[PDB]
Structure formats: C-alpha cells, structure tokens
Amino acid sequence: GSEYFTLQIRGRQRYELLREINEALELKEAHS
Amino acid sequence: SEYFTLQIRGRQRYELLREINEALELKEAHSR
Amino acid sequence: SEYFTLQIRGRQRYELLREINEALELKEAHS
Amino acid sequence: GSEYFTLQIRGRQRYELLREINEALELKEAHS
C-alpha cells in the first residue's frame, strides 16, 4: 500500500529495537 | 529530544509496532 | 496447550524477542 | 552450527506473531 505512518519512540535503545523489526518486516514483505 | 521517529509502511504494521511500543513502555514503567 | 516453544538463532535476537514477549505478557495482565 | 535459544510463548496468536518477527529478522540478517 501507499500509506505511511509515524510512531514516536521514547529512547534510542527502544527505537533501534523497533526500527530493526520494522525494517525486517518491510524486507520480508518485499521478498514475498 | 527524547523521542525518535519511526516511519512505518502500512496501517497494520503501524498498529503492531504501536502495540509493541506501548507494551515496552509499560515494562519500563514497571521496572525495578 | 497455550504455550509454544519459539526457536531462535542467536543471543541478540533471543534477548530482543524475550523483551517483547515479557512486555506483551505485562500488557495483557493490565488490559 | 547455529546456536539456538528457546522462549516459551503463551498464546498461539502471540507465538505466530513472534515467529513471524523472528523469521523476518533472520531474513534481514541473511540478506546482510
């Protein structure tokens, strides 16, 4: 789809955790 | 600036990551 | 029947998923 | 060989979600 959303994540460590999951899910969707 | 912006493609993934973020925040709030 | 064993490769991913799992369990308890 | 770690996850929907995230992270790592 063409819809983008933003989430404000408190703290660098939590951001990197969620960023990694987000990127991984995006990559998996692209590869499916 | 204590919050970092996560850009997410798709509403389902947004809702998932929002739910996880909320759970992580609650876990932090309850940490000893 | 409600428990499943998640098989994970590597300590880093284990710690990430363990943290999320614990946080989801806590959110459930407070829902 | 790989070093496996295990987590006990309560609930099939939660298990399948965390399994999906786990698999996506594995894919992202494999893709470098």
Author numbering:
A (entry chain A), D (entry chain B): 1 to 32
B (entry chain C): 2 to 33
C (entry chain D): 2 to 32
From the publication, what sentences describe this entry?
Of the six mammalian p53TDs tested, the OP-p53TD is the most thermostable. In the case of the OP-p53TD, the calculated Tm was 78.0 °C and the ΔGu37°C was 36.6 kcal/mol, which is very similar to the TS-p53TD, which has a Tm of 77.1 °C and a ΔGu37°C of 36.4 kcal/mol, but significantly higher than the HU-p53TD’s calculated Tm of 67.8 °C and ΔGu37°C of 32.4 kcal/mol. As seen with the TS-p53TD, there are also two major structural differences observed in comparing the structure of the OP-p53TD with the structure of the HU-p53TD, and these differences occur in the same two regions. In the first region, L350 and Q354 in the HU-p53TD correspond to L322 and H326 in the OP-p53TD, and in the structure of the OP-p53TD, the imidazole rings from the side chains of the H326 residues from the adjacent monomers are in proximity (2.9 Å) to form a hydrogen bond between each other. As seen with the TS-p53TD, this helps stabilize a hydrophobic interaction by bringing the side chains of the L322 residues from the adjacent monomers in proximity to each other (4.5 Å in the OP-p53TD versus 8.2 Å in the HU-p53TD). The second key difference between the OP-p53TD and HU-p53TD structures occurs in the hydrophobic core formed between the four helices. In this region, as seen with the TS-p53TD, the aromatic side chain of F341 in the HU-p53TD is substituted by the aliphatic L313 in the OP-p53TD and L344 in the HU-p53TD is substituted by I316 in the OP-p53TD. In addition, M340 of the HU-p53TD is replaced by L312 in the OP-p53TD. As seen with the TS-p53TD, this substitution at position 341 leads to a series of subtle difference in the packing of the side chains that form the hydrophobic core between the four helices in comparison to what is observed for the HU-p53TD. Together, these two differences not only help explain the enhanced thermostability of the OP-p53TD in comparison to the HU-p53TD, but also explain why its thermostability is similar to what is observed for the TS-p53TD.
